[PDB]
């Protein structure tokens, strides 16, 4: 109790509002008890002003990874980390969007790149100008990272070999900032 004044007050601000519809209730209120219990344990662990932001970052990074079915630390890639109950592609047990084709195949990650269009909500996995969402791991230990690559729709200079459709006609997606790809391929190896 002696350490939750701030957190309890922040939740009280959300609770003291009259919500016309249930759809308007803030999502975090569902998790008040579990969040407060985490704050309590953290506040009773003997942290100092200087040690607390480190510990807090470790905790919250753990939660974020586990909620996304990502490992707590890096993938090791050793023999036990793979599911061999498939004919061709072996799936990683700890990060299931990682696969390798063959026992000694080069592992790749389905979620390496999410493409981000110019219009709100136009975010997708796919292929844009020979850049796929899946990319090769450089090796192990592997720390997963997703890169968000901006794209735009080219209506004038379309390419019939890869067109898209919509309420605005035919177009092909193009990489908007090619320099963003250099960061990707300092992290991954290009999948072709």
């Amino acid at each position: 109790m002696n350490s939750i004044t701030h957190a309890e007050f922040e939740f009280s601000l959300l609770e003291n509002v009259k919500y016309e519809t249930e759809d308007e209730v803030p999502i975090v209120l569902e998790y008040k008890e579990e969040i407060i219990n985490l704050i309590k344990k953290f506040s009773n662990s003997g942290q100092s002003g200087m040690s607390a932001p480190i510990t807090a970052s470790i905790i919250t990074n753990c939660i974020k990874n586990l909620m996304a079915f990502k490992p707590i630390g890096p993938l090791v890639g050793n023999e036990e980390e793979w599911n061999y109950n498939s004919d061709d592609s072996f799936q990683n047990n700890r990060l299931s969007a990682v696969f390798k084709t063959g026992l000694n195949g080069k592992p790749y990650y389905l979620d390496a790149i999410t493409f981000v269009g110019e219009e709100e909500y136009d975010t997708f996995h796919g292929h844009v100008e020979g850049i796929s969402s899946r990319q090769y791991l450089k090796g192990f230990p592997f720390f997963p990272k997703t890169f968000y690559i901006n794209v735009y729709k080219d209506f004038e200079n379309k390419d019939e070999n890869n067109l898209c459709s919509g309420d605005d006609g035919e177009y092909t997606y193009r990489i908007k900032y090619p320099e963003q790809l250099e960061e990707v391929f300092n992290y991954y190896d290009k999948f072709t």
């Binding site: 249930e22 759809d23 803030p26 999502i27 599911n83 299931s96 969007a97 909500y121 975010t123 796919g126």
Partner: protein, 190 residues
């Protein structure tokens, strides 16, 4: 010519990996909707369920097929039911695919989960102009709270009014193994 699918599946570790097996098979001409949300850019007061619906709705607007991936508990999960019901309103093609037969690291599978289309339905109003939605929950068919009845552009004939239709009588459900999804998955969407 490229098409984008909305993958509707529920969140659980035992079926996320099975979904990823499907994703590992779905090319240049194949896109799928993907979220990008970052709550640090924007206010926990504003991130409510209507904000969630707006992001799902917007993602759905950029797709033409909703493909429900079915595991053991998919049939009764709130946000999967919303994605299916909102897909109907937007006129997406909708299919279901059982994916419980992908083996885990011990070689185990699970039996087919119940068809989510069995737990959702609709009924036309007596004047044929409104679509009322229902979900199976709490032992009976409840008016669907997550999406209000809406007007339809084409009047339903009197023979279709006041009659309940479950979604399983409208949308096809495949079995990845029995129906050879490995070779025929693209033909189910396209």
């Amino acid at each position: 010519m490229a098409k984008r699918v909305f993958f509707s599946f529920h969140y659980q570790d035992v079926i996320d990996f099975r979904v990823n097996v499907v994703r590992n098979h779905w090319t240049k001409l194949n896109q799928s909707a993907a979220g990008v949300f970052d709550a640090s850019l924007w206010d926990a007061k504003k991130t409510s369920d209507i904000a969630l619906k707006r992001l799902i709705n917007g993602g759905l607007n950029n797709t033409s097929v909703t493909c429900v991936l079915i595991g053991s508990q998919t049939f009764n999960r709130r946000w999967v039911r919303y994605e299916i019901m909102k897909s109907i309103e937007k006129g997406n093609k909708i299919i279901g695919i059982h994916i419980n037969a992908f083996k885990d690291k011990y070689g185990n599978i699970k039996s087919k989960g119940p068809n989510p289309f069995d737990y959702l339905g609709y009924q036309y109003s007596s004047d044929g102009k409104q679509l009322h939605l229902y979900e199976w929950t709490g032992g009976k068919w409840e008016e669907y709270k997550d999406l209000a009845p809406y007007r339809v552009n084409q009047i339903a004939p009197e023979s279709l009014r006041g009659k309940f239709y479950s979604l399983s009588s409208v949308y096809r459900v495949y079995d990845w193994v029995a129906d050879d999804g490995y070779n025929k998955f693209s033909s189910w969407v396209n």
